[PDB]
Amino acid sequence: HHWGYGKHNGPEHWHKDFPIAKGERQSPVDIDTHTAKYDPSLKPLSVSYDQATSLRILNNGHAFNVEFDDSQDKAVLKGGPLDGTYRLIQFHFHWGSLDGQGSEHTVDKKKYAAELHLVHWNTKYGDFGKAVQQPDGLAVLGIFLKVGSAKPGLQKVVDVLDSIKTKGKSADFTNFDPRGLLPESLDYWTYPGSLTTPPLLECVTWIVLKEPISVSSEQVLKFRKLNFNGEGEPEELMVDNWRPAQPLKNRQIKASFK
Ligand SMILES: [Zn+2]
Numbered sequence: 001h002h003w004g005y006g007k008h009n010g011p012e013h014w015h016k017d018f019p020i021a022k023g024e025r026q027s028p029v030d031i032d033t034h035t036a037k038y039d040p041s042l043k044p045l046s047v048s049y050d051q052a053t054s055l056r057i058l059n060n061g062h063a064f065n066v067e068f069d070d071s072q073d074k075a076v077l078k079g080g081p082l083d084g085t086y087r088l089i090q091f092h093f094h095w096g097s098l099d100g101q102g103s104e105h106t107v108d109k110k111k112y113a114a115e116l117h118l119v120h121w122n123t124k125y126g127d128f129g130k131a132v133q134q135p136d137g138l139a140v141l142g143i144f145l146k147v148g149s150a151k152p153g154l155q156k157v158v159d160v161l162d163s164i165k166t167k168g169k170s171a172d173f174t175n176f177d178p179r180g181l182l183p184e185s186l187d188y189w190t191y192p193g194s195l196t197t198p199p200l201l202e203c204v205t206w207i208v209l210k211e212p213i214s215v216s217s218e219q220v221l222k223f224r225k226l227n228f229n230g231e232g233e234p235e236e237l238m239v240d241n242w243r244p245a246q247p248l249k250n251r252q253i254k255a256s257f258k
Pocket residue numbers: 092093094117196
């Protein structure tokens with residue numbers, strides 16, 4: 001029926017409704033650190049999030065998205081392997097039922113507790129919907145989360161989850177600064193891939209940061225209290241909303257560092 005992460009509608013079933021699931025540039029992938037090519041021609045990333053305007057947080061049934069005003073160049077990503085300016089539209093996480101799983105990308109087969117995705121679209125395309133139909137339409141920054149010390153800048157997000165517990169619920173979420181979610185270093189790996197949920201379009205330049213951020217056990221616990229279902233429906237905890245690694249096929253992962 002409709003896709004999700006259960007036994008009956010999980011990733012292994014997606015290809016029946018979205019044949020691109022078995023495409024040549026699907027994500028996530030395992031990053032083999034010893035086969036990644038250092039590319040000295042890659043520039044440092046440029047993250048300009050000082051004018052970011054968050055608007056709302058929403059439970060869409062598969063994750064929770066924090067949405068930003070993208071009507072102007074207020075929070076942009078440029079540099080790195082990118083040509084042009086990419087505007088931040090939303091961020092969301094992928095997480096597990098246990099601390100040993102949850103990320104979508106893996107590093108030398110190592111899984112992290114969760115993975116943050118900052119989604120950006122190429123302004124040359126005018127809007128998000130046009131951007132996803134182009135091979136260079138989106139840029140996603142992926143940040144791994146490990147359990148350890150609490151991340152102060154994540155607490156405002158954690159605290160509002162009770163108010164969007166079920167699918168379709170939303171809450172005003174203004175003045176949130178996404179700079180509190182970045183690691184200290186911007187060293188990254190990059191490869192051409194796709195969205196990791198249906199429609200799985202192959203329109204993403206992935207930028208995966210090498211350095212994970214730490215979150216406390218209590219913070220990740222609060223993620224696991226959300227629901228996949230809508231209000232008044234049988235409760236299904238929102239956990240394990242990650243797609244397993246896909247074949248690299250004809251692709252090369254490049255590193256910005258050595
Ligand atoms: Zn994602």
